[PDB]
Amino acid sequence: RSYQFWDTQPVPKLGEVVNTHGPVEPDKDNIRQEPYTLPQGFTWDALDLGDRGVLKELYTLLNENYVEDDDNMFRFDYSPEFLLWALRPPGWLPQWHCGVRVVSSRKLVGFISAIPANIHIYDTEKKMVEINFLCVHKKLRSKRVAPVLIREITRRVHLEGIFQAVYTAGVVLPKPVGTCRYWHRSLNPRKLIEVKFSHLSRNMTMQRTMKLYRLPETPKTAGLRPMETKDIPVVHQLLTRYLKQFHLTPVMSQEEVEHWFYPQENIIDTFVVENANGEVTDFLSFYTLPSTIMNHPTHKSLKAAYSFYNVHTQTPLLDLMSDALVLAKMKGFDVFNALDLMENKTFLEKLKFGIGDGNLQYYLYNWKCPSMGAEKVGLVLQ
C-alpha cells in the first residue's frame, strides 16, 4: 500500500523497524510566508470562536459532517461550549482555528485545529501541538482538500517555532506509536439495543440484561465529592506524579490542570476523594460527548460519558471506576466509554465493559521512536 500524501511527510514508513529516538528532519529556519493554494472558489478564514455566530457555524459543520461509526448509524455532536473548552486552553491562538469557506456564499465547509501542549515522550520532553477536529464537508470529500488543511496548519505551527505534533485517528497511517481499543459499559441497555448500538445476547433475555447491568443508587467511596478551587494544587500534584509511569503523557502546568479538570456542567466532571484526615488522595474524571442517532423516528441522541484521567493512591482503581459508572448513571448517561490505555485493562472486564469494534491510533509528526503497548499510553484527546 502506498500513501500519495503521507509518503512525502516527515513520519516513518509503515513496517519500518524503529530503534532510534529523535526528529525525522531538522527544525526549519525559514518558513513559507504565503498560505497554500485552495481549489478555485474557496478561501481561508481564521474563526473567532468568541463570536457566538461563528461558533454556531462551527457547531453546525461538525454536527453534520464529523466522525461517524463504522456503520454510519451514529455521529459526534460536540456542543458549542464543549468546543470552547477543547479549543481555547491556555496558550491558544486564533490563527490555529483554521477554517475554509465558500467565497460566494461564505458557507463554512472545512476546518482543522491546533492547541499547544508540552509532551513527554520516553526520555524527552518537547513543546508540541495537538491536532484535532479535521473536517471536510460531505459534498467535498475525496477531492484532496485534507492534505491542504494539513500542510497549512503545519505551516502556521512552524511560524510559531514548533516542529513536532501529536494526534489520534481511527484510520491506519504511517506510522502508529500506539494502538488502543475502545470499550463500552452499558448504563441504559434497553435504549442501546433499540437503537442498535448493541445487540441482545442470544442466551440472555432483555429482563436478564437489565438486571445484569443494574448499578447502586449512590457511590461507595467514603469522602467522594466534586472538585473545588481549593483542590487545584493537590489535583495537579496527584496527576503529575501518577503519569510518570507511562511513556507518552502530557506535562501540565497548574493553570492547565485548572482548565482541563475544574467541573463545568455538561462538559467535564471531576470528583476527588477527601479522606478522614481531610487529605485528597484520589480523583476520577469524565467528559460529556453525545452522538446524533441518524435516521431514527423516535430516538434522536445517544448520551455518552468518556473516561478522561483517573488517579489512585489510596482507593483501589476498581472501586474508583465503579463509582464513576454510578455517577454517570445518576447524571442520565446511556453508556460509559473507556480506552484500554494506562491501567484500564485491569478493570474493563471486571466492571462489565464490552469491547467495541475499531481502534484509536496514536501518532507523532516529525519524531522517530519505538512503538509502545497501549498500557504505556498516558494521553487522552477529546
Ligand X SMILES: Cc1nn(C)c(C)c1CCOc1c(-c2ccc3c(c2)c(CN(C)C)nn3C)ccc(F)c1F
- Residues of this chain that bind ligand X (CB under 6 A): 67-69, 74-76, 132, 168-170, 182, 184, 291, 304, 306, 337-339, 356, 360, 381-382
Task: Tell whether 136 is in a known binding site.
Answer: yes
Would you put residue 180 in left (φ > 0), alpha (ψ -120 to 50) or beta?
beta
* Site map 343..372 versus ligand MYA, x via CB under 6 A: ----------------------xx------
Cβ at position 124, least distance to ligand X in Å: 23
Task: Tell whether 44 is in a known binding site.
Answer: no
Q: Which three cell numbers stand for residue 137?
A: 464537508
Q: Assess contact for 164 and 364: CB atoms under 8 A.
A: yes
Work out which of 32, 141, 208, 211 binds ligand MYA, going by CB under 6 A. Answer: 141
Cβ at position 195, least distance to ligand MYA in Å: 21
The interface with ligand MYA within residues 263-282 (CB under 6 A) comprises none
Question: Which stretch, 41-49, 138-146, 185-193, 275-283, contacts ligand MYA (CB under 6 A)?
Answer: 138-146
At 14, the amino acid letter reads: L
Task: Tell whether 9 is in a known binding site.
Answer: no
Cα separation, 127 vs 359, whole angstroms: 27
Cβ at position 323, least distance to ligand MYA in Å: 31
Q: Which is nearer to ligand X, 90 or 356 (CB)?
A: 356
Out of ligand X, ligand MYA, Mg ion, none, what residue 381 binds, judged by CB under 5 to 8 A for its kind, is ligand X
Site of grid cell 515522550: 121
| Residues 6+ positions from 283 with CB-CB distance below 8 Å | 227, 235, 238, 261, 270, 271, 272, 273, 310, 311
DSSP result, 226-273? E--GGGHHHHHHHHHHHHTTSSEEE---HHHHHHHHS-BTTTEEEEEE
Out of ligand MYA, Mg ion, ligand X, none, what residue 74 binds, judged by CB under 5 to 8 A for its kind, is ligand X
Cα separation, 254 vs 261, whole angstroms: 11
Is there a cis peptide before residue 175, judged by omega within 30 degrees of 0?
yes
Question: Which stretch, 159-167, 212-220, 293-301, 351-359, contacts ligand MYA (CB under 6 A)?
Answer: 159-167
CA distances from 179 to 103, 129, 151, 172, 251 (A): 40, 20, 25, 10, 21
Cβ at position 100, least distance to ligand MYA in Å: 11
HSE-up (13 A, CA, CB side) for residue 224: 21
377 binds ligand MYA (CB under 6 A): no
The interface with ligand MYA within residues 175-214 (CB under 6 A) comprises none
> Which residues fall in the annotated binding site for tetradecanoyl-CoA?
4-6, 133-136, 142, 144-146
Q: Which residues lie near ligand MYA (CB under 6 A)? A: 3-6, 65-67, 129, 131-136, 141-147, 150, 153-154, 157, 162-165, 167, 169, 171, 173, 365-366
